[PDB]
Every structure is written in C-alpha cells, then in structure tokens.
Design a protein around this ligand. Sequence first.
Ligand SMILES: *[C@@H]1O[C@H](CO)[C@@H](O)[C@H](O)[C@H]1NC(C)=O
Ligand SMILES: *[C@@H]1O[C@H](CO)[C@@H](O)[C@H](O)[C@H]1NC(C)=O
Ligand SMILES: *[C@@H]1O[C@H](CO)[C@@H](O)[C@H](O)[C@H]1NC(C)=O
Ligand SMILES: *[C@@H]1O[C@H](CO)[C@@H](O)[C@H](O)[C@H]1NC(C)=O
Ligand SMILES: [Ca+2]
Ligand SMILES: [Ca+2]
Ligand SMILES: [Ca+2]
Ligand SMILES: [Ca+2]
Ligand SMILES: [Ca+2]
Lengths: 390, 390, 390, 390
Amino acid sequence: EPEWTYPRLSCQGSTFQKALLISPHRFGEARGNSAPLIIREPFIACGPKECKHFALTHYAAQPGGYYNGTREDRNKLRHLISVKLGKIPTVENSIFHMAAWSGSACHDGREWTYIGVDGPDSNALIKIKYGEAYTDTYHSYANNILRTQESACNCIGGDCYLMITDGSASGISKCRFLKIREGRIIKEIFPTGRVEHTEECTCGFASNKTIECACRDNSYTAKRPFVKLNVETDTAEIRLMCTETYLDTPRPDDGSITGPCESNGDKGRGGIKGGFVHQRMASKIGRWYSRTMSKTERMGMELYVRYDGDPWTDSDALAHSGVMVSMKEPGWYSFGFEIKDKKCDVPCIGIEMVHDGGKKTWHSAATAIYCLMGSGQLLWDTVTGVDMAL
Amino acid sequence: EPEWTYPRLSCQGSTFQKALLISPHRFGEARGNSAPLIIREPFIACGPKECKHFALTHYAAQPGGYYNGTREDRNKLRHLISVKLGKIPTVENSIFHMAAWSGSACHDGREWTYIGVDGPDSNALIKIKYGEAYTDTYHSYANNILRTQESACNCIGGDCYLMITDGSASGISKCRFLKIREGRIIKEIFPTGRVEHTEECTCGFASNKTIECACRDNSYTAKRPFVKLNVETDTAEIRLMCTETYLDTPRPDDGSITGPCESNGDKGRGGIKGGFVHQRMASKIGRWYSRTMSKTERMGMELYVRYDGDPWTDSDALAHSGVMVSMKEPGWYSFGFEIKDKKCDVPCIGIEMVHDGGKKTWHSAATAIYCLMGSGQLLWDTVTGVDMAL
Amino acid sequence: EPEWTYPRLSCQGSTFQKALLISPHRFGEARGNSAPLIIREPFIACGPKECKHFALTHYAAQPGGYYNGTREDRNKLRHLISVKLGKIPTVENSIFHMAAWSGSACHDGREWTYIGVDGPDSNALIKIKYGEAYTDTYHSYANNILRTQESACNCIGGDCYLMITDGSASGISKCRFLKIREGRIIKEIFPTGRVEHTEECTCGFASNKTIECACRDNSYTAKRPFVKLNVETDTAEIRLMCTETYLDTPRPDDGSITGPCESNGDKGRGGIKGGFVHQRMASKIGRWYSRTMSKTERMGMELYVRYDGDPWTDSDALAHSGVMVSMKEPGWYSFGFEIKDKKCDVPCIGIEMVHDGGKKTWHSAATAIYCLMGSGQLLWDTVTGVDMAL
Amino acid sequence: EPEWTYPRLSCQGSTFQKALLISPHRFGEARGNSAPLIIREPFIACGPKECKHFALTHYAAQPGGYYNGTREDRNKLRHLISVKLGKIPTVENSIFHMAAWSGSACHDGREWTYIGVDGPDSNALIKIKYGEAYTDTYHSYANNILRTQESACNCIGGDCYLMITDGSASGISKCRFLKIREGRIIKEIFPTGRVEHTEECTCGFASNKTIECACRDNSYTAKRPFVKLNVETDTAEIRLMCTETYLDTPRPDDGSITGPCESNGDKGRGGIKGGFVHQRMASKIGRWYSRTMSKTERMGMELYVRYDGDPWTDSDALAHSGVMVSMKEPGWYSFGFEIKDKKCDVPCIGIEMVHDGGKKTWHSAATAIYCLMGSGQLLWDTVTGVDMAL
Ligand SMILES: *[C@@H]1O[C@H](CO)[C@@H](O)[C@H](O)[C@H]1NC(C)=O
Ligand SMILES: *[C@@H]1O[C@H](CO)[C@@H](O)[C@H](O)[C@H]1NC(C)=O
Ligand SMILES: *[C@@H]1O[C@H](CO)[C@@H](O)[C@H](O)[C@H]1NC(C)=O
Ligand SMILES: *[C@@H]1O[C@H](CO)[C@@H](O)[C@H](O)[C@H]1NC(C)=O
Ligand SMILES: [Ca+2]
Ligand SMILES: [Ca+2]
Ligand SMILES: [Ca+2]
Ligand SMILES: [Ca+2]
Ligand SMILES: [Ca+2]
C-alpha cells in the first residue's frame, strides 16, 4: 500500500516569502456571478501529492440572504469543507465533509483523517472520519465546549496526534491529546506541567520523537503554552514560552512581564490562535512564529524566528523576520503546515484575514500563505483587496 | 479485476450521531448565484471507495421559472441524477443518468447498476443501466404504476436484488423481487405470506444469507410489511412487523392495535418510506429504524433499535434512541445505507427533509445523515436552515 | 496499449425505449443562475468506457447578449465542444476542441479523433485532431461549402472512415470518404453509383466488412442516398433507398413515387439529417431509422425498423415502431450511435429538438436519446419542457 | 517513472491554420451568469498528455466591481492561474498557483515548474514552484523590475531553461538565463554579444543542442534580439535579427534601417512580445514568427516563415504566410508553443487579443491559436466577437 508518512528534513532555505493569496470574496459582489462560501477558521494540511484547504463554513454564500449569525461560532449548520489548495472555495468547488463548528484534519500517507466537533455546548462531541467512513467519537470531559485545534493534526508511522480541550473560556481548560490510528482513538494522553488553560494548539514535528505545539491561553496569560509531546512514550508536558516576545493578542509590551519564566503577567485574558512551524536541519532547529502587529487588535501579522535553545527557559527576544500583513489589514488566526516536496518538507505559515464589518453584515476570511523559500529577506506583504460594500 | 462486494460485519459502535447535512437550497436565494436542482426521493448508495447521493429531479433549479408541477410525482421530465456524496446537487455538479420518476441504484464491487421507471401510469417500465450501457427492462404486470424502492438496491457476489411493485395505492400491490447480474434480470422472485401491499422497501443484508426489508403498506396498515429474502434459495416471505412501536405515518398510538401480530389495525391508509439499517455483529444483529415524531404529519424523525429477536413475532416496543429531527422540522422519506470502511461496514440512516410550501411555490428537499459512531447517546438534531421566501 | 475497437454483435433486445433527455435550456431563464451554451447539430460518439456529447456552439450562453446570428450556420466563432454524456453543456462543463461550423468525432479504442470544418464558403478546410494534437487537413475540392457528417465517424482496427462532401446545396454535391489512421488521412475513397447529391451521412457498421450510411439529398429527392462502403477494398457505391417509407423531410406521401427504385420523385428539394443505426445479430441485421412525423416540417419523430433485405432494391414499407417525439414538439436532425456494454454494443438514436423562435431570439437545441432496450413495444415520448419566453 | 522530455522532429506540415479561440468575455455580459477572470499575458505550455493555458489575473471577474486598476501591470493581487487548454478561465475552473505579476511555466516530462515574479519594483523576486512545493527563488540584480518571459520555459532531459531580465525599460536591461532542475536553480548563464536590452524572450528548441529566442528590445531597436543558447556548454550569445522584416512594434518600414545587421535604426523605443516557434525537419529548420499588421499600434497579426540560414546575418525579407488577425481586431502579445503528438511535435503560435477600452473600464484578453496543419495556405482569420459594452 502507500507507505506511512514521517517528518523529513526541511528543504533548504532561510527566509519566508509571499506564496499565495486565496481571497474568495474578491468574487462576492452583488453584481457578480460567483458563490464564495462564508467561512472562518481556515487551515491547510498536505499529503504526499496535494494539499487541501479546509475551513468551517456557516453554509451560506456571498451574495446571499443568510448573513445573520455568521459572526457566531457555534450552531447547527456549520460544516467542515475543503477545496484542493489553489481553488476558490465556492458552493460547487467545495466538498462538505461533516457537521462541525471546530475542526482538524491530516493525511497519514495513505488516507485523510477529518475531525469535527459539534453537539450542544455542555455536551459536545469529537467525530472522526477516515476517508468516507465515520469511525469514532470522544465525549466532552469538562462539559464546556469541547473543541480542537483549527489546524492540521500530525501523523508519524500511521499514528496521528490531536490536541482537544474542554472547559471555561475564562477559567480552566485542561487539554488532552488523542492518539488516532486509521480513524480510531487508540490512546488518551494527559499532559503534565503548566496545564490550567491550553486551547487551539498549532502543532508540528520537531523531529521523529517530538511533536511541539504553540497554543493559546484565553484566560491567564499573553505568553503561549508550549507543549512538548514525546511520541515514543506518549507523554506530554506543557510550560509557558519564556521569550520576552509574547505571541498572544492581546499582550503587554515585550519584556514587561517580570519574575520567572512561568509568570503569567498582565493582559492575559483573551487570545488568538498563532502560527508556528518547524524548519528541521541536520544540526539546528528553526522555530518560526507569527503574531499580530497590534498588541491589542487582530491587525497586521509579523514573522519571528529562533534557532535552537529551549522555549521553556530562554527569555531572549525572537528575531523579527518581516511583515506579512501590514497594520492596515486584518490578521486573525494563523497556523503552520508543511508542503511535501520530492525529498524534503517545505514549512509554511498561513494567515486568516477576516473581513469583519460586525454583526450587521456577512463575516468571512481570505487565507494568505508564506513559505520558506530561498534566501535573503522577506519582501512583500498581503492585502485582501476586498471592499465589503460591494 | 475488482472483487465482488459482500456484506461484512459492521464497525464497532453503539449509538448514531449527526454526520452531515446536504442542504442545497441554502444557496437557492433569488439574490444568490447558484443553481441547486429541485429534487425529491434522495437516497445514498456506496461502493468500496465512494458514495453517490441520488435523487429524482424535476429538471428545474431554484431560482428559476419551472416551479409549477414540482410537487407532482410523475411526468415526462423527471430524471435520476447523482453527485458524489458531499457535493451540492446543482445543475453543473449533477450527472443525469436516465429519465425516471422512481429509482434505485447499487454498486456491486465492479460497476454501478442504475434503475429508473418511467412510461405512462397504466403501462410503465423498469429500465436498467450498468455503467454507461442501457441493458434490460421489465414490464408492468398489474398496470398501475409499476415502481421501485427509492433507495439502494443490494448486491452480494455480483447479484443485486431489487424490490418492484405494481398495483393500486389504495388496494393491492403485490411486490416482486428482481435478481440482476451485470445489468440483466436473471431471476424474478415471487414472495409468499402477507403480500397484499408492499411498496417502497428499504432493504439491507442481515447476513450473507438474508436480505431484509422494512416496507410501506399504503392501504391496510401502519405496521410495516417486513421481507426476509433468502439469497441462497432465492425465495422471499413477507409478514407484518409485530412491534407495538408502529413505524408508518399515519399511525395509531403505540400498542393500540390489539390482536395477533397480523392484525392490521387502524389508520392504515397512507404511509411513508421508512429508514432501516443493520448492524451486524459476530453474535448479534441490531436493527435500526426511523419514524416521524408526528403520528400523522411528516414532521420530525426519531431513531429506534432492537437487537435480535424475530421482527415478525416480537410485539415488544423498540428502544428509542434519539431525536434526529425535531417536530418543527420536516421529516419525510428516510432510508438506510452503509459506508465501506477498510475492514468493516458503517450503518447510516438518511432523512429527506422536504421544503414544502404547497403547490404555489417550488418543492424540493435537503438530506440529513446519521451514522453509527462511538458510544453514548445521540447528541444533536438537524434543521435545514432554509427560508423558502428567499 | 489498449486494443483497437471493432463492431461486435448487438446486445439482446427488440424495441427502443426512452433513455435520456439533455435539455440545457431548462436552466436558461433570465432569473436563473446557469449558462447553457447555444448549440446546434448535437451528436454522441462513445469509446469503450464513456460517451461524449458533441455539438457546434455559437460561443454564446443563455441568458446573454449574443443571440444575434445564432440561427445562422457558418461564421468565425462557431466551435466544436463536448461534455461527458449526462452532463449539461454549460460554459464551465464544456471543452472547446476547435473552431468548426461542421463536425464529427469518433474513438478508435485508444484515442479520440475530432474533425471540424471552417474557413470561407468557397475555400473551406477539414481539420483533424488526434487527442490534443492537430494532425492533418483536407482542402475544398468543389469550392462550395466543404462540410461533413454532424455525427460520429467509425473506426475498425484503428482505421476511421469519414464522409465529407462539397458542392451546391441546390445542385451537385458529390461526397468522398476519407480513411484516417491516428489523425492522418491515409486514403481518399471516391464512391460510384448514384452520386449526384450526398451530404450529412449517418454511418455505422453492418458487419466488420461493411459500413452503411443513410444520407441526405438536399436537391433532387426525398429518398435517402444509401452508401455501402466495403472496408476490405475501400470502395464505396451509393444508390437511393427504394422503400416506399421516404425518410427525408420534406417528402411526398409514402408510396407515391412511381417508376424504378432510383426514381427521384417529387418534393425532393430541401432535406434533414436522419437517424440510422444497426442491430447486428448473428443471423439477421436490423436497420433502425427515424423520420419526422410531419411530411413537410421539422416536427415530431417516429421510429421504423426493417430486418435484412437490401435497401437498394426493397420497396417494402418499413415497420413503424413508435413515436419518439409527438407532432407538437420539434424533431430536427437525428443520428445513430452505439454505447459499448461489457460484451456487446447497444444501438441508440438521438434527436436534436431545436427551440426555434426565429431570427429575433436565441436558437438552440435539446438532445433526446432512445436506445434498444428489452422487449415489447416503445412506451413514451419526449418533450423538451422549455418555455422560450423565460 | 516517466521519461524526461526532449524536443522531437515536428509533425509533417507546411502551413498554419486556425485552430482554436478561447474568448472568455463572450460570457462576461452583465445579464449573463458566468465569471471569466480578468487576465493579461496568456501563454500555453504542454506536457506529454495535456496543455495548460496560463495567464496573469487581476483577481477579479467580469461582471464585477474591481475593474479599476486592471490596466496596470504590477500590484499585490496579481496571480499566475491556469486551466486545462480548451476550458474557459473562470473563477471556478482556474487554479491559482502563486502570487505573480510576471510568469512562465514548463513541463519536463515528470512535473510542472511554475515561475512567478512579485515584490516591489526596486527589489522583486523570481519564485519557483515544482508541483505543489515552493522550491527556490532568485534576487533582483539590477533593482529595476526583475521579470521573465510571459511564455513557456523549455526543458530537455530534466533541465529547464528560463530567461530573466532586470533593468530599465528605457535603457539597459541585461538578461540572464537560469537552468533549473526539479525546481532549483543549478546554473546562471550570462550571455555574450549584443546584450544591452533583451526582455520577454519567446524561446524554443532549434535542436537538442540549441535553444533560440526571439526577444523584445524596448529602448534601442525594432529589430528583435535573437538568442542562441547552447545547451551542452550552457553558454548563450545574443545579436539582433538582421531580416529587413522587423518584428517589433513600433517599427519603421521594412528595409529602411540601413547599415550592417547590428544597426539599431529608428522607432526602437517601445516594443511587444512576439511569437516564434520552430519546425524541426530532419534536414532543415523552419522558423515561424508573428508580428502585428499595424506598424505602430497593437492591431492585427500576420505569420512569416524562413527556412534555414542564420537569423543574425540574413537580411532577407521573411516570407509572408497569412493574416491570423485583421487590422480591425487587437493583436497584442504572441508566443510559440508545441503540442506533443504521439511521435512528433506540433508547432503553434498563440495570440493575446486584448479588449482595451482604456482605464475607465475592465481590461482583459482572449487567446487565439494557429498550429502547423497540412499544406496549402492559411485560410481564415480570428475575431474575438466581444462587445465591451455588454
Ligand atoms: C524520521 O524517520 C524516518 C525513518 O523511520 C526517516 O526516513 C526520516 O528521515 C526521519 N525524519 C527525520 C527528520 O529525521
Ligand atoms: C460474507 O462473505 C464474505 C466472503 O464471501 C466474507 O469475507 C464476509 O465476512 C461474510 N460476511 C458476513 C456478514 O459474514
Ligand atoms: C469483428 O472482428 C473482430 C475480430 O477482429 C471480432 O472480435 C468481432 O466479433 C467481429 N465483429 C462482428 C460483428 O462480427
Ligand atoms: C533529441 O534526443 C532524444 C533522445 O535524447 C531523441 O529521441 C530525439 O529524437 C532528439 N531530438 C532531435 C530534434 O533530434
Ligand atoms: Ca491570552
Ligand atoms: Ca460552476
Ligand atoms: Ca400505511
Ligand atoms: Ca431532399
Ligand atoms: Ca523596440
């Protein structure tokens, strides 16, 4: 059969560069003839030959008549959809995989696993699909919006790992990791460490033994919870990132949080899912991260790297590597993913750029992608080009 | 070349969950830009790698100008169409297979068999297509609307079995089974037993030896005719379901039909096609059924199960397993189908949710799917989200 | 490589039955959201696994703004297009093969040959395409609208035969047959016999040694020129069909043409391309033909068969086998084609049903298909269901 | 795995004929229902089985609201898109490959290499994609609009060659060639000879040893820079075409530039990308060229040929071979490409036909194709048929 996927060394390169904008609403004018779906929480996951661009649709198109409610997050109509990366996600181009108001997906080398959560807030359900077949579920353990990554899960040797979490958005949300093989949960992993609130983890492989994730604390800190999951022992520990370049939004000024690495700090309440991807070299590991340019709003997006060290203990600033989205443009969730080239993996970050005109009109998103490419420095930014009044 | 398909044991699970909603008219607004087809009698059938979503279209789209007559069942324009399950059935996504105002289709492991009936009421015709080729036909034997299942036919080892019936909707309709191999009828099966009215059979494999069907008696009873068809001797016998949980609509109160299992009881006139699917375990058989929440109108839909026993002799109430569609939402025809996972089969029930605003506007349907998935209880219901005035 | 196609015995059956309507303009309402192409001269040709539905488009859609000129036949914008049979031929579904105002195509078992004619009236050009590649041309020999079949060419052992003709529409048009192998003309065949006007031949295989064609005489007779082409010697002879059931339109009453078989008769001027397909049995040959129900207008379409005999000498009436299109509906060009089933060939006739509101509005066509299917008699007719004012 | 592609001998033929018109804006009427993309700089490139039709879109459709700015060349929204040749480039049919305001692409027998340039004018960037993976980049060396061919690159044995140039449009632009293997630049080639301005090279194989290109000098001359690139030593030399039939636009009268082949002459300022393709015979090489009918405006397009000789030293007029587009119709960029028949290659020229109504309306283009086909003379011209007011 195809053989199972493993992380490989990254393809050679030393800077990210603007790769692709998928801006569906450039075609949603009332006088045009297209039907872009109203979506949010996009992410991309790739298998050996193709990438799919996933998103959670409110099951409505622009132009159209169901804009009411599209700023909400959870309802009975939200579905996980995909298009091949490079296609515009329209009513006809999209595949509707399952009813879901939170999702993830990943390819294990042989088939796609799709993950979606739906159900009532106090009783939600993780649903897993392997190809066409619905294969397994996992129940709410804290009865308060069980939810998952909004980005790719990660498979190695056929075993796929997924972050899930449950609990109060302004309180405790202890995450768990599920180990999934061919659509079935074969193991629950309970992390150790600083565990009081971890959600929306962006995970990737640091090597064949470790998955690392930069996550969101929506309650206590502007530092990101950082998971190190050991794949050989199936154990996870979590501690806060110690860098002075806080990656959450909102956040205080860099370096202003005093005290040891684990200090929570100020402006911890609220948050945003953040980009994180690995560049695996033979002797050195690059960790690439994105954060909004505004400290308090979802506006702009800048790139940072750091090679080696230990995220849990290094307080050093990350090196700024370029403006992907200017302050003038929306920069909402971001996520990492890898494209498989013939012999190496290409790290990328994608950026959700939400068109927000509030609760009175449609609410949806463009997706911008930056990937490691060549050398020198990052050269250009992304605008969505959308005028919401059309 | 590909192996012939056989029924396998079902995948492990003990409850159904909400899987997917295909709701094409969420895109039919007169200010939108899409073309969902006007359809009724949807059903799904899967082969080893893919499922197709079939329906009978009135060869008209919403928005459009051909709404008049779309509530009627039989005319010269209806066609059997399909899209791959997960795509929205629009003008451009659909394949028009054949002219048909009643249909069925199944995959046998190597190719699709499509069945459609058309012709005048008094002298209609079963036409069979195998892949691209029209291959055989079967004539009306009672000259009163020859018609078939409106759901998947069933193949084992290259032989596909199909219910057909012919006769008065208010009187006698004796059904027959056809055994089809590579598109050509190789056998006609004349059932024994209680045969005065059987139509719209939903059938599946209880084992490699027996096909069972839960059917509609439109004249005499609210108990469903239940068929046991022995695939080895090609013989079939029919008797009424004895359970006090009557599955047809309209129906009397549960348990009010006194007398032996064969008493017809009251409010037998009228009916609805009902969902039915098997969960085949090594030692036991679960039979899952659906019926409307309302006793008299096509509103709501609830799930029921029974393990083992004999449907012909057990008067026991069936075990309620969850509300799939509430009473505020339409619940019209339902059907069972099975998805092929790698090593086991997944049972699902599909539900036609008709948007009915009477004869003065368009008339068409959404399809909701629930599949056996994990354990626990069924968690969420389905709404179409469609406003017919848009 | 795939092996070359040969004609096989026909699949068993004894009557034609309504198979499929492709009516694109059921979706062309000004208030709808679709783009059916404006087309005419449809035909279908099949290879081993699929059929394509071809047509000559005026390169315009309904609704739209280029209806002027769509009743003309020849201009600089007409193109040969195809969709997979069963799809609606819309702007997005269609493939544009080449610029052409007359066409043909056929599959030889390994690849598609496409044929289109364009160029000035007095100097037109046959262009041949094998797959994606343009491989050959043939020049006008009589300088007066070189043109070809408007239906499938026919391949045997890799050699594909095509009728072409050139000359006055109200005078002499001597046809030629080209023998084409992998897109290149390897032989010209000059027929013998009654040769003064032959155009729009509908050809098929009577066996592995003979191609027969029922053609159109636009100038001198309402009888059809009937070609017998010997594939082993690459020679052709033509004589008029002698049956009293004249197949052209316009035509005089049946049997009213006196004198020997080759007598031209009355009302010979004008004509229509006609359906003709073979049913090859081991000991008997059925020839199936269609003609309009009106003797003078393109309205209605009826089926006729005759088994064996010799079309050149038998004066016997053909046996009427059913009304495919009532007098009330358009019946314009018709054509034959065969669908390949696993072990036998299925004969069909398709009917162009043109929506004609004259020169002041759009002009386009639905395609109706009838195929040999089962036994008994033909049961239902086809309406397009199109209201041209919408 | 698939063999690497090499240039073969051309298929037999001696004249070009009209092959195909892709005219997407025949469907762009505000009362229609389609979404053709607004595009400029189309080109076509073929691999062994399929050709793709590429263009640079402004990420806007007709009808729509983003027409302003669609006449400008470089901005943050332009993307390289493709559709399979023969499909209309709409919103739903196109694949968005990468952000790019200048592009090229070629197939090497195993995979597609896509090249796009974006970034600010003073510091732009060549980005290369091989299949789905972003693989390499090349920096600006003269900091004045680094840019590439706007037509197919050329691969032999897995090595693909690409012209790039950087420099002032009014002065010096020294071009370079990149040698790319599986998406990564393995060699930079610095030409010799007359190198002061070479841009928009149309290149193809004269043999397995030489790539030749006919290019644009936008500052000094109306004679085209003509490149001979020796693929074995990876060296290139450039000299002006000596023919009195000057191929650029604007141009002086044919033969009015006196002096040696290298004299620049008059009306050198300005230019246009020109068509050029090879017909490789066993003993002789035909070089086919296109140029506008107008000497000063981008109207019309005519074909010219010359067999053998040396383009650098032959002052001979080229042989006129037919009017592909009359003077009433737009003739803007043109390019050559080759289709792969089974055993030989077919040369074609494509012509961009821009609908230009100035900066106050949409600006986009149709693509017309002429291919070597049979013998005789070129018979018909091409019109777009588009009314910009619709
Ligand atoms: C991971 O393991 C596989 C072998 O199991 C190996 O091919 C691959 O290179 C390893 N990945 C990395 C980054 O070391
Ligand atoms: C049915 O038979 C096939 C082989 O004939 C077997 O592999 C399959 O497991 C059997 N199914 C059941 C339900 O026993
Ligand atoms: C035609 O010839 C081939 C063998 O070359 C044979 O297989 C086929 O049956 C023949 N067709 C008919 C109708 O005899
Ligand atoms: C080029 O080389 C290939 C093999 O390397 C050969 O098959 C082909 O015919 C050659 N082409 C030309 C134009 O000589
Ligand atoms: Ca926070
Ligand atoms: Ca479409
Ligand atoms: Ca009943
Ligand atoms: Ca005539
Ligand atoms: Ca110039």
